[PDB]
């Protein structure tokens, strides 16, 4: 394998050995995530931006420090993206999975739950959810103290008009002119602090009150109901540093 060893070891992450796991080697299975995976580079600007994001929206339970930071391309997803590129209000945020759903969440990208499941488990019906505090979407991460290492993703959502809910609303169809759901917090990241990579907002302030009164959500949430709105940029590997 000619992969650096980064890659190397998140190819052996999202895999694993063991039954039908002695066998595939790295390249094979690199392969098919039909997904270009970089390292981005410690010292580079993007990183440091990268870095600044996830310090500063993060209190208690672990401790966020970053390891590895991969720029990611998925065969076809910027292409699909361009209906929505030119869309005002596109933002840069997190999303968290556990590290078994990354092999499907790479190779067929985040996907919208089948129509037929039941609408609990989907506070704001069946789409794709981001938050723009790393915190918050570390949660999904389920990691450990025994094997506290996580994957968190930073996408491109094309938000466009956003709907603004304080509570559950359970249904995936929006009113005419919105093309998401903003869940709306108590804290949310310092907007003076947010700046603008490409025309992407990364909302990178420290987190502050919101002056949102009546809500259930601690954090931010978004939500987008078409796969086209969604282009995701970065994965992060990150050390979880428990009590
Ligand atoms: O985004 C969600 C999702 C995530 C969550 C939990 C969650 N997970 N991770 C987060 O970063 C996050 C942030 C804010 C709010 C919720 C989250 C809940 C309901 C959901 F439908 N997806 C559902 C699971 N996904 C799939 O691709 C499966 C195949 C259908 C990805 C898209």
Request: hydrophobic content about 35%; some cysteine.
């Amino acid at each position: 394998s000619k992969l650096p060893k980064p890659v190397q070891d998140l190819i052996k992450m999202i895999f694993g050995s063991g039954s039908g796991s002695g066998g595939d080697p790295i390249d094979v299975n690199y392969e098919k995530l039909k997904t270009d995976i970089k390292v981005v580079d410690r010292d580079s600007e993007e990183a440091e931006i990268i870095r600044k994001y996830v310090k500063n929206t993060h209190h208690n339970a672990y401790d966020l420090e970053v390891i590895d930071i991969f720029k990611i391309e998925r065969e076809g997803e910027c292409q699909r993206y361009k209906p929505f590129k030119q869309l005002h209000n596109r933002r840069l945020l997190w999303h968290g999975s556990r590290t078994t759903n990354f092999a499907g969440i790479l190779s067929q990208g985040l996907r919208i739950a089948p129509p037929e499941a039941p609408v609990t488990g989907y506070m704001f019906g069946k789409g794709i959810y981001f938050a723009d505090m790393v915190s918050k979407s570390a949660n999904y991460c389920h990691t450990s103290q025994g094997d506290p290492i996580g994957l968190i993703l930073l996408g491109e959502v094309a938000l466009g008009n956003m709907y603004e809910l304080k509570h559950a609303s359970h249904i995936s169809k929006l009113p005419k002119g919105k093309h998401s759901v903003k869940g709306l917090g108590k804290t949310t990241p310092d907007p003076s602090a947010n700046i603008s990579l490409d025309g992407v907002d990364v909302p990178l302030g420290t987190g502050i009150s919101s002056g949102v009164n009546d809500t259930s959500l601690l954090y931010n949430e978004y939500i987008v109901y078409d796969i086209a709105q969604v282009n995701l940029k970065y994965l992060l590997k990150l050390k979880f540093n428990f009590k």
